[model samples]
Target: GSMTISNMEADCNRLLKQREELTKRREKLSKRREKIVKEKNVANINEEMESLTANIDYINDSISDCQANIMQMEE
Candidate 1:
């Protein structure tokens, strides 16, 4: 079996688009966390902050994976 260059290009496009969306989501979550920090009440927002951090981490990991895949496709 073989893959075509056109297919690879399209796959790269999809991956790039997904990466953009993930980046946006990560930024949004980070801003929310910043807001939470600025407003104070860290004690009450511990769980919320934890969840936000986890989601941001997950998004970053996902973006890394997506970039790796795109590199492979380009190669």
Candidate 2:
């Protein structure tokens, strides 16, 4: 493997794009959750909130992993 600056640059760029995507999806889920609250759908809100929270947690973990990877690569 030819380790070079250009390769690392692209690697960081790709990870940044992925992290942005996760952030967008997380926002979408939060918006959906708020809509559910406004409608007062008690029956589904609890389960839906749990699922949404789990998804957000996973997305956050993934973003952190991406950061760690970029730092390691840059070093």
Candidate 3:
């Protein structure tokens, strides 16, 4: 998903732009709670939050895999 989320080849082209936008969205979710703001815009917040949770779970798995891979190369 990270590949589709970002390009692996031309690492700095389209990927950087999208990553900045994504970071803003992520930061808002993380820090701007209990504001009592209306849904003047759009999107289901619950659904998006659920997906973010799943992404973190996958992220944890990836971190574990990264540690395991490095440990395998240990002497």
Candidate 4:
């Protein structure tokens, strides 16, 4: 019947609108996830930089100590 067809068309249009809304929400979530991933990467890189700096400081201290010991031995 024409009335049934009209009702079905209205329902289809409603569903399409819902589908578009859901798609937009999904895209927003994806962008948020990407932002979180980028922040995590930045944190990891900062930790690595701190560890490397500590290692360099340790080496420098050891070299200074060795030199001091050598100078004392000569005296």
- TM agreement with the true structure for every prediction: 0.48, 0.51, 0.49, 0.47
What is the C-alpha lDDT profile of model 1 across 1-75, one tens digit per residue? 266656655654575565566567656666776788777555545565566567657666765776677678677
| 1-75: candidate 3 lDDT, tens digit per residue | 556323423433444445455556665664544343531322455466557666656655655665555456442
Runs in model 3 deviating more than 4 A are 1-27, 30-33, 37-43
- Lowest summed lDDT over 10 consecutive residues: which window, candidate 3? 34-43
True lDDT of residue 60, candidate 1:
66
lDDT of 1 at 64: 71
What tens-digit string does per-residue lDDT give for candidate 4 at 1-75? 647555644544554455455456555555665687766454554555455456556555655665555456446
Look at candidate 4 and give me any clashing residue pairs.
none
| Alpha-carbon lDDT, every model | 0.63, 0.65, 0.51, 0.55
On lDDT, the candidate that comes out on top is: 2
Lowest lDDT 10-mer window, candidate 2?
A: 40-49
Query: Model 3, residue 28: displacement in angstroms?
Result: 1.6
Q: Write the per-residue lDDT of candidate 2 for residues 1-75, one digit (tens) a residue.
A: 566756756755675566566567656767877787777555565566566567657656765776677688767
Total backbone clashes of candidate 4, pairs 3 or more residues apart or in separate chains: 0
Which residue segments of model 1 deviate by more than 4 Å?
1-3, 40-75
